[PDB]
Amino acid sequence: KPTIALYWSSDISVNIISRFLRGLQSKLAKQNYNYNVVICPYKTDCLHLEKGISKENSFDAAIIANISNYDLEYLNKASLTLPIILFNRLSNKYSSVNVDNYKMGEKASLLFAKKRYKSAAAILTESLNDAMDNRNKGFIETCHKNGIKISENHIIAAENSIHGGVDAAKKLMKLKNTPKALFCNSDSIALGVISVLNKRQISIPDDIEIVAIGMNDREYTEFSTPPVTIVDIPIEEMAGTCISLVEKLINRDIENPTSILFDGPLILRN
Numbered sequence: 001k002p003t004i005a006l007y008w009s010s011d012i013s014v015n016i017i018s019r020f021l022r023g024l025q026s027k028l029a030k031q032n033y034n035y036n037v038v039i040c041p042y043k044t045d046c047l048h049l050e051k052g053i054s055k056e057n058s059f060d061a062a063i064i065a066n067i068s069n070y071d072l073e074y075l076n077k078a079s080l081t082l083p084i085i086l087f088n089r090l091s092n093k094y095s096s097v098n099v100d101n102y103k104m105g106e107k108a109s110l111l112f113a114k115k116r117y118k119s120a121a122a123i124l125t126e127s128l129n130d131a132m133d134n135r136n137k138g139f140i141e142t143c144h145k146n147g148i149k150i151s152e153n154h155i156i157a158a159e160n161s162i163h164g165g166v167d168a169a170k171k172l173m174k175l176k177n178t179p180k181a182l183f184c185n186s187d188s189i190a191l192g193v194i195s196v197l198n199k200r201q202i203s204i205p206d207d208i209e210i211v212a213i214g215m216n217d218r219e220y221t222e223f224s225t226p227p228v229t230i231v232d233i234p235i236e237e238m239a240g241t242c243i244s245l246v247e248k249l250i251n252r253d254i255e256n257p258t259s260i261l262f263d264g265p266l267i268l269r270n
Contacts, residue, residue: 002060003036004246005052009066011044011128013160013188015216016235020065023239035060035243047071058082061246063239066128083249083256085242088131088233095245095258097238101131104231104264105138105183108211111229111266112181113146115209120148120181123168123189125160132185135213139183154179158189165192173200184212187221190228198225205270214267227269234262 006024008017017039024037038059042050045068051057063085067075075084076093086096112120120143127133143150154175158168165188172178173196184190190212194204202208204226214221214232221228241260248254 001034001036002250003038004243005059005062006037006039007047007050007053007062007064008039008041009044009047009064009068010041011068012066013186013215015188018217019235020239023236024243026236027240027243031243035246037243044068045070048074053080053082053084055081061085061250063087063242063246068129083246085245087238087242089129090259091257093257095249095254095256097241097245097260097262098131099233099238099262099264101134101264102138104213104233105135105140106142107231107264107266108183108213109139109142109146109148111211112143112148112183112209115181117148117179117181117209119154119179120150120183121154121156121172121175121179122150122183122185123156123158123165123172123193124185125158125164125189135185148181149179160186160188162188162192162195165189166195167192169193169196178208180208182208182210184210187212187214187216187228187230190230191220191224194224194226194228214264218267221269229269230267231264232267233264238262 040052048071052059053062058081061083065087067086067089084094086094088098089096090098140150156168156171158164190210197204211229214230221230
Protein backbone atom coordinates (compact mmCIF):
# COMPACT_ATOMS: atom_id res chain seq x y z
CA LYS A 1 0.00 0.00 0.00
CA PRO A 2 1.26 3.55 -0.66
CA THR A 3 2.01 5.67 2.43
CA ILE A 4 0.97 9.28 3.03
CA ALA A 5 2.86 11.17 5.77
CA LEU A 6 1.30 13.92 7.86
CA TYR A 7 4.18 16.13 8.97
CA TRP A 8 3.25 17.66 12.35
CA SER A 9 5.23 20.72 13.50
CA SER A 10 6.04 21.00 17.24
CA ASP A 11 4.61 24.57 17.36
CA ILE A 12 1.07 23.24 16.77
CA SER A 13 -1.19 22.79 19.79
CA VAL A 14 -0.96 19.00 20.27
CA ASN A 15 -4.68 18.63 20.97
CA ILE A 16 -5.55 19.60 17.43
CA ILE A 17 -4.01 16.35 16.21
CA SER A 18 -7.13 14.41 17.24
CA ARG A 19 -9.25 16.07 14.51
CA PHE A 20 -6.69 15.32 11.87
CA LEU A 21 -6.51 11.69 12.96
CA ARG A 22 -10.32 11.49 13.17
CA GLY A 23 -10.67 12.98 9.69
CA LEU A 24 -7.98 10.68 8.25
CA GLN A 25 -9.30 7.47 9.94
CA SER A 26 -12.75 8.37 8.59
CA LYS A 27 -11.68 9.08 5.02
CA LEU A 28 -9.60 5.88 4.77
CA ALA A 29 -12.40 3.73 6.21
CA LYS A 30 -14.66 5.03 3.45
CA GLN A 31 -12.06 4.08 0.83
CA ASN A 32 -11.31 0.62 2.22
CA TYR A 33 -7.88 1.65 3.55
CA ASN A 34 -6.17 1.93 0.18
CA TYR A 35 -3.45 4.09 1.84
CA ASN A 36 -1.38 3.80 4.97
CA VAL A 37 -1.07 7.09 6.83
CA VAL A 38 1.81 7.88 9.15
CA ILE A 39 2.16 10.94 11.44
CA CYS A 40 5.70 12.44 11.57
CA PRO A 41 6.19 14.93 14.43
CA TYR A 42 9.08 17.25 13.66
CA LYS A 43 10.58 20.27 15.37
CA THR A 44 9.52 23.75 14.20
CA ASP A 45 11.71 24.88 11.25
CA CYS A 46 13.15 21.40 10.71
CA LEU A 47 10.94 20.11 7.89
CA HIS A 48 13.86 20.48 5.48
CA LEU A 49 15.86 17.81 7.42
CA GLU A 50 13.15 15.16 7.10
CA LYS A 51 14.22 12.15 5.07
CA GLY A 52 10.64 11.13 4.13
CA ILE A 53 10.57 14.15 1.75
CA SER A 54 14.07 13.53 0.26
CA LYS A 55 15.03 12.12 -3.13
CA GLU A 56 16.15 8.92 -1.42
CA ASN A 57 13.75 7.91 1.36
CA SER A 58 10.46 9.53 0.28
CA PHE A 59 6.93 8.65 1.27
CA ASP A 60 4.40 8.39 -1.58
CA ALA A 61 2.91 11.77 -0.58
CA ALA A 62 3.00 14.23 2.31
CA ILE A 63 0.63 16.71 3.94
CA ILE A 64 2.26 19.48 5.99
CA ALA A 65 -0.04 20.51 8.83
CA ASN A 66 1.57 23.91 9.60
CA ILE A 67 4.57 24.77 7.44
CA SER A 68 6.84 27.57 8.81
CA ASN A 69 8.10 30.44 6.65
CA TYR A 70 11.60 29.00 6.93
CA ASP A 71 10.44 25.52 5.82
CA LEU A 72 8.27 26.98 3.07
CA GLU A 73 11.22 28.84 1.55
CA TYR A 74 13.04 25.47 1.37
CA LEU A 75 10.01 23.84 -0.29
CA ASN A 76 9.61 26.79 -2.67
CA LYS A 77 13.13 26.29 -4.09
CA ALA A 78 13.24 22.47 -3.87
CA SER A 79 12.32 20.09 -6.66
CA LEU A 80 10.85 17.17 -4.73
CA THR A 81 9.92 13.65 -5.79
CA LEU A 82 6.48 13.28 -4.12
CA PRO A 83 3.19 15.22 -4.07
CA ILE A 84 2.98 17.63 -1.11
CA ILE A 85 -0.22 19.22 0.18
CA LEU A 86 0.07 22.35 2.31
CA PHE A 87 -2.61 22.71 4.96
CA ASN A 88 -4.03 26.25 5.17
CA ARG A 89 -1.36 27.98 3.06
CA LEU A 90 -2.04 29.32 -0.33
CA SER A 91 0.70 28.49 -2.83
CA ASN A 92 1.14 29.03 -6.54
CA LYS A 93 3.47 25.99 -6.56
CA TYR A 94 2.00 23.36 -4.23
CA SER A 95 -1.58 22.13 -3.95
CA SER A 96 -3.35 23.11 -0.74
CA VAL A 97 -6.45 22.62 1.38
CA ASN A 98 -7.28 25.91 3.16
CA VAL A 99 -10.06 27.69 4.98
CA ASP A 100 -11.15 31.29 4.31
CA ASN A 101 -9.46 32.75 7.37
CA TYR A 102 -10.39 36.38 6.88
CA LYS A 103 -14.07 35.43 6.42
CA MET A 104 -14.02 33.43 9.68
CA GLY A 105 -12.99 36.55 11.65
CA GLU A 106 -15.56 38.48 9.67
CA LYS A 107 -18.38 36.09 10.69
CA ALA A 108 -17.43 36.50 14.39
CA SER A 109 -17.56 40.29 13.98
CA LEU A 110 -20.87 40.28 12.08
CA LEU A 111 -22.49 38.21 14.83
CA PHE A 112 -21.59 41.01 17.27
CA ALA A 113 -22.61 43.69 14.69
CA LYS A 114 -25.96 41.96 14.23
CA LYS A 115 -26.50 42.16 18.02
CA ARG A 116 -25.51 45.87 17.96
CA TYR A 117 -22.62 45.61 20.39
CA LYS A 118 -20.72 48.87 20.48
CA SER A 119 -17.28 47.58 21.46
CA ALA A 120 -15.36 44.31 21.81
CA ALA A 121 -12.24 42.85 23.34
CA ALA A 122 -10.02 40.10 21.85
CA ILE A 123 -7.87 37.53 23.57
CA LEU A 124 -5.29 36.30 21.09
CA THR A 125 -2.70 33.63 21.17
CA GLU A 126 0.31 34.51 18.94
CA SER A 127 -0.13 33.80 15.22
CA LEU A 128 1.76 30.69 14.16
CA ASN A 129 1.23 31.67 10.49
CA ASP A 130 -0.43 34.11 8.09
CA ALA A 131 -3.77 32.28 8.25
CA MET A 132 -4.01 33.07 11.97
CA ASP A 133 -3.16 36.72 11.36
CA ASN A 134 -5.88 36.84 8.71
CA ARG A 135 -8.53 35.51 11.10
CA ASN A 136 -7.66 38.35 13.47
CA LYS A 137 -7.61 40.93 10.68
CA GLY A 138 -11.01 39.66 9.51
CA PHE A 139 -12.44 40.27 13.00
CA ILE A 140 -10.72 43.62 13.67
CA GLU A 141 -11.33 45.18 10.22
CA THR A 142 -14.93 44.00 10.20
CA CYS A 143 -15.46 45.53 13.62
CA HIS A 144 -14.10 48.89 12.36
CA LYS A 145 -16.44 48.70 9.31
CA ASN A 146 -19.48 48.04 11.50
CA GLY A 147 -19.00 50.59 14.29
CA ILE A 148 -17.62 48.20 16.90
CA LYS A 149 -14.73 49.85 18.78
CA ILE A 150 -11.72 47.68 19.59
CA SER A 151 -9.35 49.67 21.77
CA GLU A 152 -5.74 48.45 21.37
CA ASN A 153 -5.46 47.79 25.07
CA HIS A 154 -8.46 45.46 24.81
CA ILE A 155 -6.42 43.06 22.77
CA ILE A 156 -4.80 40.75 25.32
CA ALA A 157 -2.05 38.25 24.48
CA ALA A 158 -2.56 34.71 25.83
CA GLU A 159 -1.00 31.27 25.75
CA ASN A 160 -2.99 28.80 23.69
CA SER A 161 -4.31 26.58 26.50
CA ILE A 162 -7.17 26.49 28.95
CA HIS A 163 -4.77 27.79 31.65
CA GLY A 164 -3.76 30.55 29.21
CA GLY A 165 -7.45 31.52 28.89
CA VAL A 166 -7.73 31.53 32.68
CA ASP A 167 -4.68 33.87 32.95
CA ALA A 168 -6.06 36.16 30.21
CA ALA A 169 -9.54 36.44 31.79
CA LYS A 170 -7.97 37.45 35.13
CA LYS A 171 -6.28 40.37 33.31
CA LEU A 172 -9.45 41.14 31.34
CA MET A 173 -11.17 41.39 34.72
CA LYS A 174 -8.66 44.04 35.88
CA LEU A 175 -9.65 46.41 33.08
CA LYS A 176 -11.49 49.52 34.29
CA ASN A 177 -13.98 49.11 31.43
CA THR A 178 -14.40 45.59 29.97
CA PRO A 179 -16.43 45.40 26.69
CA LYS A 180 -19.52 43.23 26.41
CA ALA A 181 -18.30 41.24 23.37
CA LEU A 182 -15.25 39.01 23.42
CA PHE A 183 -13.46 37.30 20.54
CA CYS A 184 -11.09 34.42 21.43
CA ASN A 185 -8.89 33.15 18.63
CA SER A 186 -8.89 29.64 20.12
CA ASP A 187 -11.55 27.54 21.81
CA SER A 188 -9.07 26.48 24.55
CA ILE A 189 -8.69 30.14 25.42
CA ALA A 190 -12.49 30.51 25.52
CA LEU A 191 -12.90 27.51 27.83
CA GLY A 192 -10.41 29.02 30.29
CA VAL A 193 -12.18 32.41 30.09
CA ILE A 194 -15.56 30.88 30.93
CA SER A 195 -13.91 29.06 33.90
CA VAL A 196 -13.10 32.49 35.39
CA LEU A 197 -16.36 34.22 34.36
CA ASN A 198 -18.33 31.39 36.00
CA LYS A 199 -16.33 31.62 39.28
CA ARG A 200 -16.85 35.40 39.33
CA GLN A 201 -20.57 35.03 38.41
CA ILE A 202 -20.36 37.15 35.28
CA SER A 203 -23.32 36.29 33.06
CA ILE A 204 -22.83 34.76 29.63
CA PRO A 205 -24.10 36.09 27.21
CA ASP A 206 -25.79 38.81 29.32
CA ASP A 207 -22.72 40.57 30.75
CA ILE A 208 -20.22 39.17 28.18
CA GLU A 209 -20.85 37.35 24.90
CA ILE A 210 -18.06 35.14 23.48
CA VAL A 211 -17.26 33.89 19.99
CA ALA A 212 -14.21 31.68 19.60
CA ILE A 213 -12.31 30.14 16.70
CA GLY A 214 -12.86 26.37 16.88
CA MET A 215 -9.56 24.50 16.69
CA ASN A 216 -10.02 21.53 19.02
CA ASP A 217 -12.83 18.95 19.12
CA ARG A 218 -16.24 20.70 18.62
CA GLU A 219 -17.80 18.78 21.54
CA TYR A 220 -15.88 20.72 24.23
CA THR A 221 -17.60 23.95 23.24
CA GLU A 222 -20.93 22.20 22.38
CA PHE A 223 -21.36 21.03 25.96
CA SER A 224 -19.35 23.52 28.03
CA THR A 225 -21.19 25.53 30.73
CA PRO A 226 -22.41 27.55 28.91
CA PRO A 227 -22.04 26.35 25.29
CA VAL A 228 -19.70 28.61 23.32
CA THR A 229 -20.48 29.87 19.85
CA ILE A 230 -17.69 29.11 17.43
CA VAL A 231 -16.43 29.74 13.94
CA ASP A 232 -14.98 26.30 13.24
CA ILE A 233 -11.95 25.28 11.28
CA PRO A 234 -13.42 22.08 9.61
CA ILE A 235 -10.28 20.06 10.18
CA GLU A 236 -11.84 16.60 9.83
CA GLU A 237 -13.27 17.32 6.35
CA MET A 238 -10.11 19.17 5.30
CA ALA A 239 -7.89 16.25 6.30
CA GLY A 240 -10.12 13.86 4.30
CA THR A 241 -9.87 16.20 1.29
CA CYS A 242 -6.04 16.11 1.55
CA ILE A 243 -6.20 12.33 0.86
CA SER A 244 -8.51 12.95 -2.16
CA LEU A 245 -6.02 15.40 -3.60
CA VAL A 246 -3.11 13.03 -2.94
CA GLU A 247 -4.85 10.19 -4.81
CA LYS A 248 -5.71 12.44 -7.77
CA LEU A 249 -2.13 13.78 -7.87
CA ILE A 250 -0.54 10.28 -7.78
CA ASN A 251 -2.96 9.07 -10.48
CA ARG A 252 -2.12 12.26 -12.49
CA ASP A 253 -5.74 13.37 -12.89
CA ILE A 254 -4.86 16.75 -11.40
CA GLU A 255 -1.89 19.07 -11.34
CA ASN A 256 -0.24 21.51 -8.93
CA PRO A 257 -1.46 23.95 -7.63
CA THR A 258 -4.97 22.71 -6.96
CA SER A 259 -6.40 24.83 -4.13
CA ILE A 260 -9.50 23.80 -2.20
CA LEU A 261 -10.98 26.54 -0.10
CA PHE A 262 -13.32 25.55 2.76
CA ASP A 263 -15.90 27.68 4.45
CA GLY A 264 -15.31 27.75 8.26
CA PRO A 265 -18.89 27.52 9.59
CA LEU A 266 -20.35 29.71 12.29
CA ILE A 267 -21.85 27.25 14.74
CA LEU A 268 -24.35 28.96 17.04
CA ARG A 269 -24.45 27.60 20.56
CA ASN A 270 -27.30 28.44 23.00
